[PDB]
Design a protein around this ligand. Structure first.
Ligand code: SF4
Ligand code: SF4
Ligand code: SF4
Ligand code: FCO
Ligand code: CA
Ligand code: CA
Ligand code: CA
Ligand code: NI
Ligand code: H2S
Lengths: 489, 279
């Protein structure tokens, strides 16, 4: 009694994604995730001036280019042997932090929300699934359904301007956005002035107000209508985080700390234990067993028998692990926003102080949205602090020279999850460059041992009571905020 | 009255051209979508998915045959029979599945369009995906049209990403022309098919640092005063109106902040590299 559903393109994610599921007895029983577009940045980068990489890698993705730029300039800092100044570190955090806000807002509203909110009857809001299980369908009190839908739709529309203001904030010290100019090996290219710090701050306060007063309340309200969506889209429940937004000059402390949570147990993150498999990916490896990124290889092969994706399959200690706000928030376990503490009590009867107090509810479709909203608030609190710490006039740039032979690795968290860039230099040129990105950890295919990637695994058990309107499949996938440009590069 | 119908397709892109469009002001994106264009298909933001999304795209391309703009973001990879970019799957009338390559999609839609607009340096000129080291046979729209012997009005709006003003301005000018061709002639294009309205000015000739350049006052590092030439600035070889328009609603621009990397030019990136070595 199995039925196959194939969705290509899976829209309202970044990039080219195909999802295939098998449904039996009203639930997903198997799944395949496929990235269908390849560019090969790791090949393109070879032989270049290593400093060019922080411009080239941003073109992996126009949604998260600051994450790639950050990872790249940190890899370069490491390889070149240069230490960034206090003000350089803070300025880089302000550039990147502004895009964390932009990316999460863009995601929830402009990618995710049309699975819940009924837009106006003009393209691109229509056509849509006939039985889309929207707010206007779920809420049986018609006036309340209309009011809640209008509330959500007005936020979607207002968020168009809020995300644009976030890019004004990125451009303040970043030069422009998408694709900043302001981060380089050795720090940042423009020293913040008192006037420009104030101009960033004024815009930031508008974004922060939207986050606290509109976004957080909408998310908790949405979850209170879709309580069933805290009970599915579960997956492996393994998460990893690398650390993001260093809070001191020796990169020992972060806003969100590194760590791993596997099979119910916390452990430290050890980069030696990351490897990539390609058994079901369109790539050739020179040796079996999966490869650590420091010896990674990018030899595309769309004819490889048994392969189905251009995404490689990263594993940590041979375990699939997911990444993103859920991962970071689970690992750090920060205190919840005052809004979240209040609305969890008022709308759900849940007493919760810290993220982990959500328990099982964290590992679900709605849990991923909640994690992302909470992290938006948490990042705003941090940006508010950094705006007080930044020192007008203080040097942000330190000179360096391209080394003959070196290696460096930049570790960070992109808005979608753990990110590293590995850089090897020989004869002052890029010898190897290997990118292990966020969505790479989420939207990967099966490894050589048949273990499904996190999105594939989280699809198992998702309800599909209506095969012609399989809305929960896209809801699960979009809860991960996938970026297939990043996943494949 | 009537909005410009748009089918927006992505090949080997990064979505940055789309994101830059979302940053538009005067008009802003809400007004663009509700009042200026009918964005019929766009993979990043549209409500429908899979079969429904593709069926809608093809329905619009038929209904509005010769009367929609085909917007292309990203390059077209031709190696391995186009299999480096699969844009969707079509479910025939018997249940069998068929993948659609970017090559197949553009070959199909371009002849149906009123005009094709290649937004971004990737689609216009090949850009980063077509740069040295790539193995995907990555190609620009103009080169793919030439190879395919497709004669369709083509306008290039380059930049990595293009400024939203360039994309909106070009599309509005094209639509105005279609509605009244003698009152609104098509914008004059340069030899690389991009509008002189936005790409006629040389950055360096219009740069506020030109007085410093003339006096040999060069910034020793990014955070020192002076012209940016010694830091790698490609303004001298780059044609765009960034010096006047600036970026992100006039907040900053590449040259004030750092250096121009020549992102609008047909030889970007290879002819503009290394980025931090002077021209
Ligand atoms: S032109 Fe640049 S910003 Fe646009 S799709 Fe290509 S890489 Fe991305
Ligand atoms: S900063 Fe660049 S564009 Fe401006 S005068 Fe100097 S070299 Fe020319
Ligand atoms: S200043 Fe140069 S690099 Fe910046 S947007 Fe204009 S052309 Fe592109
Ligand atoms: N966020 C983001 Fe992009 C992804 N996945 C990166 O890195
Ligand atoms: Ca194939
Ligand atoms: Ca990689
Ligand atoms: Ca032909
Ligand atoms: Ni991305
Ligand atoms: S980012």
């Amino acid at each position: 009694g199995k039925v196959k559903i194939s969705i290509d393109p899976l829209t309202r994610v970044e990039g080219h994604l195909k999802i295939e599921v098998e449904v039996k007895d009203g639930k997903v029983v198997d799944a395949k995730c496929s990235g269908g577009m390849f560019r090969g940045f790791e090949q393109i980068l070879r032989g270049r001036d290593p400093r060019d990489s922080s411009q080239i890698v941003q073109r992996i993705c126009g949604v998260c280019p600051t994450a790639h730029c950050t990872a790249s300039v940190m890899a370069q800092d490491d390889a070149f042997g240069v230490k960034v100044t206090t003000n350089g570190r803070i300025t880089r955090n302000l550039i990147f932090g502004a895009n964390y806000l932009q990316s999460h807002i863009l995601h929830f509203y402009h990618l995710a929300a049309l699975d819940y909110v009924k837009g106006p009857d003009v393209s691109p809001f229509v056509p849509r699934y006939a039985n889309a299980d929207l707010l206007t369908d779920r809420i049986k009190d018609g006036a309340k359904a209309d009011a809640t839908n209008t509330y959500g739709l007005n936020q979607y529309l207002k968020a168009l301007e809020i995300r644009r203001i976030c890019h004004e904030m990125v451009a303040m010290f970043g030069g422009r956005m998408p694709h900043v100019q302001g981060m380089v090996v050795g720090g940042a290219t423009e020293i913040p002035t008192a006037d420009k710090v104030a101009e960033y701050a004024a815009r930031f306060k508008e974004v922060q107000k939207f986050v606290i007063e509109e976004y957080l309340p909408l998310i908790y309200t949405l979850g209170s209508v879709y309580t069933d969506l805290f009970e599915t889209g579960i997956g492996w429940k393994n998460v990893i985080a690398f650390g993001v937004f260093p809070e001191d000059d020796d990169y020992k402390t972060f806003l969100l700390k590194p760590g791993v949570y596997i099979d119910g147990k916390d452990e430290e993150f050890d980069s030696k234990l990351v490897k990539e498999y390609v058994g079901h990916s369109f790539f050739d490896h020179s040796a079996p067993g999966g490869l650590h990124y420091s010896v990674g290889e990018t030899n595309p092969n769309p004819d490889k028998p048994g392969a189905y994706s251009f995404v490689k399959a990263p594993r940590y200690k041979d375990k699939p692990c997911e990444v993103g706000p859920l991962a970071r928030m689970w690992v750090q376990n920060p205190e919840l926003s005052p809004v979240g503490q209040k609305l969890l009590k008022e709308l759900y009867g849940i007493e919760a102080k810290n993220f982990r107090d959500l328990g099982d509810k964290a590992f679900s479709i709605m849990g991923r949205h909640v994690a992302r909203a909470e992290e938006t608030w948490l990042t705003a609190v941090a940006v508010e602090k950094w705006l007080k710490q930044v020192q007008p006039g203080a040097e942000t740039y330190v000179k360096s020279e391209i080394p003959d032979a070196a290696e460096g690795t930049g570790f960070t968290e992109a808005p979608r999850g753990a990110l590293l860039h590995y850089l090897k230099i020989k004869d002052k040129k890029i010898e190897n460059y290997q990118i292990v990105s966020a969505t790479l950890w989420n939207a990967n295919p099966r490894d050589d041992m048949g273990q499904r990637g996190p999105i594939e695994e989280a699809l198992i058990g998702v309800p599909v009571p209506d095969i012609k309107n399989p809305v929960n499949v896209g809801r699960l996938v979009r809860s991960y905020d996938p970026x297939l440009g990043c996943a494949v590069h | 009255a009537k909005k410009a119908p748009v089918i927006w397709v992505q090949g080997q892109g990064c979505t940055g051209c789309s994101v830059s469009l979302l940053n538009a002001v005067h008009p802003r994106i809400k007004e663009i979508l509700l009042d200026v264009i009918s964005l019929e298909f766009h993979p990043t933001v549209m409500a429908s998915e899979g079969e429904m999304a593709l069926a809608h795209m093809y329905e619009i391309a038929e209904k509005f045959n010769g009367n929609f703009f085909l917007l292309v973001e990203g390059a077209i990879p031709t190696a391995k029979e186009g299999r480096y970019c699969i844009v969707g799957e079509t479910l025939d009338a018997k249940g069998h599945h068929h993948e659609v390559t970017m090559m197949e999609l553009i070959r199909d839609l371009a002849p149906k369009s009123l005009a094709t607009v290649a937004v971004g340096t990737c689609s216009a000129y090949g850009g980063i995906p077509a740069a040295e080291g790539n193995v995907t046979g990555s190609k620009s729209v103009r080169d793919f049209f030439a190879d395919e012997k497709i004669e369709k009005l083509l306008v290039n709006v380059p930049g990595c990403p293009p400024h939203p003003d360039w994309m909106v301005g070009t599309l509005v000018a094209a639509w105005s022309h279609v509605l009244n061709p003698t009152e609104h002639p098509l914008p004059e294009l340069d030899d690389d098919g991009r509008p002189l309205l936005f790409f006629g000015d040389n950055i360096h000739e219009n740069c506020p640092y030109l007085d410093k350049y003339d006096n040999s006052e060069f910034a020793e590092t990014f955070t020192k005063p002076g012209c940016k030439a010694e830091l790698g600035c490609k303004g001298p070889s780059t044609y765009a109106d960034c010096a006047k328009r600036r970026w992100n609603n006039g907040i900053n621009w590449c040259v004030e902040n750092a250096v121009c990397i020549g992102c609008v030019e047909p030889d970007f990136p290879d002819g503009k590299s290394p980025f931090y070595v002077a021209e």
